[PDB]
Design a protein around this ligand. Structure first.
Ligand SMILES: CCCCCCCCCCCCCCCCCC(=O)OC[C@H](COP(=O)([O-])OCC(O)COP(=O)([O-])OC[C@@H](COC(=O)CCCCCCCCCCCCCCCCC)OC(=O)CCCCCCCCCCCCCCCCC)OC(=O)CCCCCCCCCCCCCCCCC
Ligand SMILES: CCCCCCCCCCCCCCCCCC(=O)OC[C@H](COP(=O)(O)OCCN)OC(=O)CCCCCCCCCCCCCCCCC
Ligand SMILES: CCCCCCCCCCCCCCCCCC(=O)OC[C@H](COP(=O)(O)OCCN)OC(=O)CCCCCCCCCCCCCCCCC
Ligand SMILES: CCCCCCCCCCCCCCCCCC(=O)OC[C@H](COP(=O)(O)OCCN)OC(=O)CCCCCCCCCCCCCCCCC
Ligand SMILES: CCCCCCCCCCCCCCCCCC(=O)OC[C@H](COP(=O)(O)OCCN)OC(=O)CCCCCCCCCCCCCCCCC
Ligand SMILES: CCCCCCCCCCCCCCCCCC(=O)OC[C@H](COP(=O)(O)OCCN)OC(=O)CCCCCCCCCCCCCCCCC
Ligand SMILES: CCCCCCCCCCC[C@H](O)CC(=O)SCCNC(=O)CCNC(=O)[C@H](O)C(C)(C)COP(=O)(O)O
Lengths: 606, 178, 100, 458, 38, 170, 55
């Protein structure tokens, strides 16, 4: 059905159209923000047409558009897969993007370079979708590196600020450590089984496939902020709030989770790596959640929640439940996007206050965002019958029913109670409290560009879990049979998580115990991974270059040995041979010596 | 940022600058307001007593134990305002603070529009060159009679003279370029 | 002191010749040294060159080999011969060292 | 191939005979077309390589370069029109001619059948280069740099001279065609183990290996922009082209006589990449970037697997174009700033909006962003190196992380951050500066569309 | 801003009857320009 | 494209069997695509091909005929061996696009048969080893300086083994 | 016509090189014309009224 193929190729052409308009002089004359917002809107509708097709009958289309090099045995070609993962994600991503660009127009209003900002956001979407629908992994690499570079360009939008520059260099470094893993996997699949195309890599099921998948797991940990190198996604919040929503919140981070689902057929064979990520996903879930409890920056708390939810997503991939992990990716995108733009609304409406401490009683001052915030908060806490509930409790009870690390099982559940706690922290401090904002009040959220997108995503946050769960193909053969405590555990732990947090917030209002330091710190300054591993490594890695590798072995030792020594050896030799009295007697006698030696040279060799 | 740094700090400015860090690091612990305003007038009490200690030695022994009490009772994430160091919005709108000596390489076409703008700009540049001599001379005639020099610069002291080394405190790129 | 010149300043060529293109100080040479460089540079090397390079046909035979394979794979499969026999130089031609 | 060459020679008469005012445009316009005639060699519709005549040949490995050598002469003459525009009208016509002779000689060296024709032309290229570096070099130390560039190459060169005359006696002709279709198998003696080192060492020296690369940082530092472009883009690659054509003979020894260099290069790749991380002179950092990205090449021309060689050919052409682009933009900052220091000049995008886009694309070419021939190249060398020993990824894995860090640091501390308060005001960008860049990157974009052309002999 | 042309000091070294003057080798002072001795 | 060099299985499609009153949102759209996207294009395309068929031209394949190989070729005779290293370097590619097709024919057979690839697609993976075990046995150890003399030796080093092992079995 | 003052005197220098170049490269062929058509892969028999295969 060409309608299907053409549609998958068309979304890319339509989104690339804003990029070249800015290349030509035409954008000055038309409005770039409005034009870009409309075309993503049309791209979402175009994406819907294949999505309905896939629902009718499950067909997967591999589209080989262009050939790039024959390269002898390994031919390289540009291929877009249209498997359930690719088209489901393509639709969810563009809806979020359509929401954010409208938000972007309101948020960055008064920025002198709005058009460039919108331009990079769509370039990000083009790389993100290429990363999504990539058959051969070389294209997956183009997407993997591609979102990394544009994140660097967009985290540090405001280049002047060194803090933004530091975060951008952070993000590239963590991503590049991840890139080493993908290169290792790519090289192993460029040798052994031979083609970077997924359709053939999957014929490596009954092989070792540990050297390679360990590489992809390493790539995922860097891209998805698992316990190892978890800090750059918190650091990424130095970016503009809309950038934080579409890339820090949904498309960029889920890329690591998406890669492993693509390569799962291979993942199911190796038991060792499955528990490895189950284990690290579990550690990141709580580690990030505990850090979020004491953070006082609104954007920071949401970002930690982005990492904690992906930690749960990592856990399901670790328990070899790929389809549900993808289901959470889609539902995760709707609500996290909402909360970040919700705070975008609060931060912009207030005098750019990004701290929960000075922000209060937004519920009465701004009901529209507060309503959106609690809708999102409950979805994050898996309120029954909301989008989180359809996918999240499936994951919870999956854990409660599988054979798993006891430590992983316990931490994931309290991580769920912690998600309710920090969710409670945000609404109590941000919304339900006496106002503590600066005294002049100038709040307006009436702008259509704020409401509309927030309104549209809110509709998605309310109904998406209903629609996606029923429509997707039956998969995973879930276990609905459980003792009732386990069946309802997700619901109860979420309930008491808020209950306990609400209790603690009340304790704050009293006039007592101004200071409270119960390991609060470990929690508040990111588990101290940032304070220690960011000051030692960059210090011991640069000291060795300047002091040891550059000046010691370069410069002096490699210049005194080869280039300089040969300089000296000769210089000294000329000094002795050319220091001559000039007297004839001396010189002549040397002629005597010569005659003598030559007489002998003949004599002995007679 | 405006005034110049004093060489050594007095006892007072060290005490009175703790009253700021302290009270401001007490409003991170006391997230609410009534609790804070309470727990803080109790802070002043601490500083209010031991105000009239005349025994310097003692005073510098209350200060040295105050700033260690504080270091161990500080909040890791205090409330630092935006536009202040470390916290956000600090260098945000610096990408848009171009340094104003760049409008001098504009093409005669660009400066063709925006006409009256450059008519006033050329006046100010006449002001700057018209006084560099009287300024530097002032800066010098009033030079220190000793090696003791502070970064403080003199006012005008005569009509028509423009308070010196002024071209970059005035003509500063505007804070929010937006 | 040894006589030598005082440092020569670098002129703001953009002060006069406000249309300076960076090639030469007097204006007409500049204009005619970019009107010929953008042209011979971009207009008939990046364009005519890429046109010609794009149309080089079956470069290094890799357009020929995707057919010869197809008729060999067509011929070998239908006649039942192995698609890529395992020895290329026929064993009969080889005169292996007999003793060893 | 005498159209890529004779018309070139005639450039010299044109630089001299032409008017002082019109000398620049006649030379630059004509060599752009000289590059267009060079493109004809790319028409290879068959495997049989093109033996134009007895002495002159062009095979897949040389053709991708001859075109680059012809392409940069236009660019070199466009990047040096500023400095060298303060000269006496006879110093210019000397510089223009010097640049012209480099590609005449380099075109022939890359298009030479007899290996000693390579040697005579190979070592001749030093004369034009040393003059460009020493005569017009800005710093007090170019006399020194020139000495380093002449001796390191020369001491390596005389061993190759003895070796090639040696094989001519052993085989009977230094004709690359025959030497290939003839049985020259070294016998792993102690002596042969020396022959191999004699032939490879001269090539390994101008292709900076970790042990002998000190000449390149010193040379590019004080060299004028045109000399630094030539050294990075064509001069260093002369060493690689030589290693590809000379190891056709000495076939058995490199299996075991390469370990020393391979390890020298891969560890060298890490240390050279790292010292880029804290080097204050921008031209210094690009030069060590050049050493590391060329250390990868000597580690693929020695593993000797089809992909290595293909990776090498991809990377050499690609890194050549990228490095120049970096050396060319470094010069544009140097001429307005008047200092090579990286720390000064912070925030330029705020004042030079586009040059910064060129800086960004050059850095992304410098690090391996994927839809670029630069990445395809490294991806391939990486693969083979992995095949040689799976452990190689660790060392070729510390280099990728470091390469990302220094490439972006050049962008972060030169083209971002707050603007420098008031250095000599930075005059706007000339259109020549920007084109000289565009001319470097537009070909990098076009080649990445069809990588097959620069794919090597393998 | 000026390619550094050699100053007097760079020139000085090349004077003296021997480029690399060692102990009791600096004693030698350049030969008379006229090629005639006192 | 030759249905036999790039095969392709016959298609079996379940017939439409709607069981809902609601109207399928796909069928309507297609009815449009077919009119506003296909018909317009279809019209142009034809008009292309008739423009082509007026001055229809032809291009042939350049049959390269066989020629003496290395084993027939004198030692040191650079003429004959040159003609014979090309004849091989040529078949080093014809024997490589063949392997390109098995790389491809398979890839399709695992997209066309998902969840069954483990089984239905074993007609080709049996061939991907019947072809890979051969490509490994004539072209693999060789350096980047692959030449017919070296394949002649890579083989003949092993023809000893298919003669020493055989003799050994005795 | 050879307008002087660098009018066509010079502009025709490089172009002329090309022609001379092409004149030699087609002359080199004339020399290396053994095996004109005596090569094995391409040894067709002369088609009627055709002097030589490749000139
Ligand atoms: C798969 C394919 C790869 C996918 C992944 C690719 C890697 C990931 C993306 C990397 C992007 C790197 C980057 O930051 O570049 C932005 C950079 C613009 O940055 P900027 O900060 O807006 O520039 C500000 C300057 O002041 C200039 O802006 P301005 O204020 O002057 O505005 C006017 C406008 C005017 O724009 C122009 O430059 C016009 C140039 C016209 C050339 C052709 C003329 C017509 C020829 C007919 C024949 O200038 C621009 O905004 C663009 C500047 C372009 C600089 C030179 C670009 C040369 C061509 C680049 C082609 C890239 C590949 C093809 C796409 O240039 C690009 O937009 C590159 C787009 C690359 C798209 C790649 C493919 C996307 C997916 C397919
Ligand atoms: C700056 C950061 C740079 C990061 C670079 C990361 C490079 C990782 C890969 C380097 C090592 C490659 C080793 C390749 C195989 C070595 C030879 C071999 O075939 O080993 C087989 C082995 C599987 O065999 P098995 O039965 O498991 O026994 C292993 C213990 N004897 O296979 C194995 O032993 C696999 C061992 C792990 C391979 C994947 C490692 C991924 C990263 C691991 C953690 C890195 C730090 C975090
Ligand atoms: C027993 C069951 C009985 C039947 C109950 C059935 C209930 C099924 C659910 C009905 C409501 C569905 C819904 O309203 O969706 C909200 C939509 C997001 O929904 P979602 O499916 O997530 O789409 C995003 C990409 N997947 O979000 C929206 O569409 C918001 C509105 C968007 C308006 C788009 C306007 C397009 C034209 C723009 C130019 C004017
Ligand atoms: C999972 C269980 C085990 C858990 C522990 C396992 C180890 C986890 C960590 C492994 C190593 C991760 C990378 C280490 C460096 C991390 C990046 C970094 O430190 O950069 C941050 C630095 C300062 O930024 P920051 O402290 O965030 O503050 C910004 C706001 N003030 O900003 C900077 O620019 C610093 C300087 C950067 C440029 C030079 C950096 C060194 C480059 C070469 C070395 C790279 C790191 C070592 C090699 C890779 C190791 C994996
Ligand atoms: C100092 C730099 C040079 C150090 C040594 C460089 C390598 C050896 C010399 C140059 C390369 C060379 O051709 O040496 C091989 C030569 C024997 O030649 P070979 O082809 O092995 O002949 C064997 C006949 N049965 O064997 C030799 O030439 C030995 C040469 C010994 C002297 C080397 C130069 C010393 C200079 C002072
Ligand atoms: C030659 C040796 C090296 C010489 C270096 C210096 C040469 C300078 C002078 C000559 C310049 C022109 C000649 C070199 C460029 C050649 C361009 C070319 O060959 O295009 C071929 C392409 C047809 O594609 P083809 O590969 O034939 O089809 C594959 C079938 N399997 O035809 C086309 O598609 C043309 C398309 C034009 C626009 C293409 C833009 C595509 C950009 C894609 C990448 C975008 C992202 C790049 C990121 C880079 C990051 C650094
Ligand atoms: C929230 C963090 C809690 C940290 C609280 C902190 O640790 C406890 C605390 O500050 S303990 C205060 C005691 N600090 C003094 O007692 C200094 C007294 N210093 C003098 O009395 C001077 O000598 C002078 C006469 C000049 C005062 O005059 P002035 O009016 O201040 O200018």
């Amino acid at each position: 059905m060409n309608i299907f193929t053409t549609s998958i190729l068309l979304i890319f052409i339509l989104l690339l159209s804003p990029i070249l308009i800015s290349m030509s002089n035409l954008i000055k004359h038309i409005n770039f923000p409005l034009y870009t917002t409309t075309s993503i809107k049309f791209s979402f509708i175009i994406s819907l047409l294949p999505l309905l097709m896939f629902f009718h009958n499950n067909m997967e289309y591999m589209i080989t558009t262009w050939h790039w090099v024959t390269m002898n045995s390994m031919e390289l070609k540009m291929s877009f897969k249209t498997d359930f993962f690719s088209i489901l994600f393509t639709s969810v991503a563009l809806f979020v993007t359509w929401s954010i660009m409208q938000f972007s127009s309101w948020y960055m209003h008064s920025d002198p370079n709005i058009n460039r900002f919108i331009k990079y956001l769509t370039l990000f979407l083009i790389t993100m979708l290429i990363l999504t629908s990539a058959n051969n992994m070389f294209q997956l690499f183009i997407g993997w590196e591609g979102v990394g570079i544009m994140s660097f360009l967009l985290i540090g939008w405001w280049y002047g600020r060194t803090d933004a520059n530091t975060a951008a260099l952070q993000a590239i470094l963590y991503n590049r450590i991840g890139d080493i893993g993908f290169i290792l996997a790519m090289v192993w699949f460029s040798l052994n089984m031979n083609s970077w195309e997924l359709q053939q890599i999957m014929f490596s099921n009954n092989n070792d496939n540990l050297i390679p998948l360990m590489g992809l797991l390493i790539a995922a940990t860097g891209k998805s902020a698992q316990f190892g190198l978890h800090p750059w996604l918190p650091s990424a919040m130095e970016g503009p709030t809309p950038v934080s929503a579409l890339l820090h919140s949904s498309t960029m981070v889920v890329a690591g989770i998406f890669l492993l689902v693509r390569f799962h057929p291979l993942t199911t064979n190796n038991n060792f790596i499955l528990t490895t990520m189950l284990c690290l996903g579990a550690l990141t879930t709580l580690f990030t959640a505990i850090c979020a409890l004491t953070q006082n920056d609104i954007k920071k708390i949401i970002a930690f929640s982005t990492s904690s939810q992906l930690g749960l997503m990592m856990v399901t991939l670790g328990m070899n439940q790929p389809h549900l992990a993808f289901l959470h990716i889609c539902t995760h995108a709707f609500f996290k996007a909402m909360l970040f733009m919700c705070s975008g609304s609060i931060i912009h409406s207030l005098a750019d206050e990004q701290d929960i401490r000075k922000m209060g009683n937004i519920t009465k001052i701004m009901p529209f965002t507060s309503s959106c915030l609690v809708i999102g908060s409950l979805a994050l806490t898996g309120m029954p019958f909301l989008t989180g509930f359809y996918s999240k409790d499936l994951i919870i009870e999956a854990i409660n029913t599988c054979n798993t690390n006891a430590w992983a099982l316990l931490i994931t559940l309290i991580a769920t109670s912690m998600t309710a706690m920090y969710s409670m922290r945000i609404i109590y401090f941000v919304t339900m409290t006496k106002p503590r904002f600066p005294p002049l009040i100038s709040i307006n959220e009436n702008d259509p560009d704020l409401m509309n997108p927030i309104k549209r995503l809110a509709f998605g946050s309310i109904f998406a879990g209903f629609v996606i769960s029923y429509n997707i193909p039956p998969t995973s053969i879930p276990v609905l049979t459980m003792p009732w405590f386990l069946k309802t555990t997700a619901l109860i732990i979420s309930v008491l998580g808020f209950l306990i947090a609400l209790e603690l917030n009340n304790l704050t209002m009293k006039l007592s115990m101004n200071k409270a330091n119960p390991y609060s710190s470990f929690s508040t300054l990111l588990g101290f991974f940032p304070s220690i591993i960011h000051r030692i490594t960059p210090m011991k890695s640069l000291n060795l270059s300047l002091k040891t590798s550059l000046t010691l072995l370069d410069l002096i030792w490699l210049e005194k040995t080869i280039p300089k020594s040969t300089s000296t050896l000769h210089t000294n030799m000329t000094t002795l041979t050319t220091n001559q009295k000039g007297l004839i007697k001396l010189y002549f006698m040397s002629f005597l010596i010569n005659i003598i030696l030559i007489i002998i040279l003949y004599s002995i060799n007679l | 940022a405006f005034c110049a740094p004093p060489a050594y700090l007095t006892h007072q400015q060290k005490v009175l600058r703790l009253y700021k860090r302290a009270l401001r690091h007490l409003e991170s612990w006391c997230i609410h307001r009534d609790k804070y305003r309470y727990f803080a007038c109790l802070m002043r009490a601490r500083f209010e007593e031991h105000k009239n200690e005349k025994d310097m030695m003692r005073a510098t022994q209350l200060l040295r134990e105050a700033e260690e009490e504080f270091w161990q009772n500080q909040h890791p994430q205090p409330y630092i305002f935006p536009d202040s160091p470390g916290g956000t919005s600090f260098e945000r709108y610096e990408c848009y603070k171009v340094p104003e000596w760049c409008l001098d390489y504009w093409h005669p076409s660009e400066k063709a529009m925006y006409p009256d703008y450059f008519s006033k700009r050329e006046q100010w540049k006449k002001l700057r060159m018209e006084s560099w001599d009287r300024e530097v001379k002032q800066l010098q005639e009033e030079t220190s009679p000793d090696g003791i020099m502070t970064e403080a610069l003199p006012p005008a002291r005569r009509e028509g003279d423009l308070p010196p080394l002024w071209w970059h405190i005035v003509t500063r790129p505007r804070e929010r370029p937006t | 002191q040894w006589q030598e010149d005082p440092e020569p300043e670098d002129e703001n060529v953009y002060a006069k010749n406000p249309d300076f293109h960076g090639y030469d100080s007097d204006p007409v040479v500049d204009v005619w040294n970019m009107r010929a460089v953008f042209f011979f540079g971009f207009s008939i090397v990046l364009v005519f060159g890429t046109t010609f390079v794009a149309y080089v046909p079956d470069y290094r035979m890799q357009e020929w080999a995707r057919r010869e394979a197809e008729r060999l794979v067509k011929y070998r499969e239908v006649n039942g011969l192995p698609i890529m026999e395992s020895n290329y130089f026929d064993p009969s031609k080889i005169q292996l060292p007999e003793d060893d | 191939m005498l159209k890529i060459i004779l018309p070139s020679l005639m450039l010299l008469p044109l630089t001299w005979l032409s008017s002082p005012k019109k000398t620049w445009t006649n030379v630059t316009s004509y060599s752009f077309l000289i590059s267009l005639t060079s493109l004809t060699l790319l028409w290879q519709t068959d495997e049989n390589y093109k033996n134009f005549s007895n002495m002159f040949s062009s095979d897949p490995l040389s053709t991708p370069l001859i075109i680059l050598t012809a392409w940069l002469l236009p660019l070199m003459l466009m990047a040096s029109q500023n400095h060298l525009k303060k000269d006496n009208n006879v110093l210019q016509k000397l510089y223009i001619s010097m640049l012209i002779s480099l590609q005449i000689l380099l075109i022939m060296t890359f298009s030479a059948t007899e290996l000693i024709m390579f040697y005579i032309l190979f070592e001749a290229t030093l004369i034009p280069t040393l003059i460009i570096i020493t005569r017009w070099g800005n710093q007090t130390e170019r006399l020194n740099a020139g000495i380093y560039f002449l001796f390191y190459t020369l001491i390596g060169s005389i061993p190759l001279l003895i070796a090639l005359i040696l094989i001519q006696n052993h085989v009977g002709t230094l004709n690359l065609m025959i030497l290939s279709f003839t049985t020259h198998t070294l016998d792993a003696s102690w002596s042969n183990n020396l022959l191999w080192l004699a032939c490879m060492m001269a090539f390994l020296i101008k292709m900076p290996l970790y042990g002998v690369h000190l000449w390149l940082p010193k040379a590019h530092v004080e060299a004028p922009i045109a000399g630094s472009m030539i050294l990075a883009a064509i001069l260093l690659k002369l060493g690689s082209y030589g290693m590809i054509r000379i190891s056709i003979i000495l076939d058995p020894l490199t299996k075991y006589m390469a370990y020393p260099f391979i390890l020298l290069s891969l560890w060298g790749m890490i240390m050279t990449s790292s010292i880029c991380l804290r080097q204050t002179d921008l031209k210094s950092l690009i030069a060590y970037s050049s050493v590391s990205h060329m250390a990868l090449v000597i580690a693929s021309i020695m593993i000797q697997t089809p992909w290595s060689f293909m990776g090498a050919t991809m990377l050499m052409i690609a890194h050549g174009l990228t490095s120049s682009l970096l050396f060319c933009l470094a010069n544009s900052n140097y001429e307005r700033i008047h200092s090579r220091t990286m720390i000064m000049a912070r925030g330029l995008q705020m004042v030079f909006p586009l040059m910064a886009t060129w800086w960004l694309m050059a850095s992304l070419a410098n690090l391996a962003l994927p839809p670029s021939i630069n990445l395809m190249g490294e991806l391939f060398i990486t693969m083979s190196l992995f095949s040689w020993s799976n452990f190689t990824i660790i060392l070729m894995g510390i280099n990728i992380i470091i390469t990302g860090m220094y490439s972006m640091y050049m962008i972060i501390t030169t083209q971002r951050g707050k603007l420098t308060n008031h250095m000599i005001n930075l005059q706007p960008s000339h259109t020549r500066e920007l084109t000289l860049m565009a001319l470097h990157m537009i070909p990098l974009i076009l080649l990445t569309t069809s990588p097959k052309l620069i794919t090597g002999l393998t | 801003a000026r390619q550094w042309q050699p100053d007097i000091e760079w020139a000085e070294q090349f004077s003296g009857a021997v480029m690399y003057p060692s102990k009791e080798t600096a004693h030698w002072k350049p030969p008379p320009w006229n090629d005639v001795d006192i | 494209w030759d249905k036999d060099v790039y095969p392709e299985p016959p298609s079996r499609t379940p017939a439409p069997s709607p069981q809902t009153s609601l109207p399928n949102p796909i069928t309507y759209l297609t009815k449009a695509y077919d009119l506003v996207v296909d018909w317009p294009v279809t019209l142009v395309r034809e008009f292309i091909e008739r423009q082509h068929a007026k001055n229809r031209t032809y291009y042939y394949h350049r049959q390269y005929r066989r020629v003496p190989d290395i084993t027939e070729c004198k030692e040191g005779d650079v003429l004959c061996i040159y003609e014979a290293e090309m004849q091989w370097r040529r078949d080093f590619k014809v024997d490589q696009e063949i392997m390109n097709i098995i790389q491809e024919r398979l890839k399709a057979c695992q997209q066309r048969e998902g969840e069954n690839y483990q089984q239905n697609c074993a007609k080709e993976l049996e061939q991907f080893t019947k072809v890979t075990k051969a490509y490994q046995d004539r072209y693999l150890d060789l350096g980047a300086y692959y030449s017919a003399r070296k394949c002649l030796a890579k083989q003949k080093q092993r023809m000893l083994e298919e003669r020493k092992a055989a003799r050994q079995e005795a | 016509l050879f307008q002087l003052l660098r009018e066509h005197w010079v502009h025709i220098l490089v172009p002329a090189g090309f022609v001379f170049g092409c004149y030699l490269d087609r002359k080199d062929d004339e020399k290396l014309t053994a095996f004109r058509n005596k090569s094995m892969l391409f040894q067709r028999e002369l088609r009627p009224n055709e002097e030589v295969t490749w000139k």
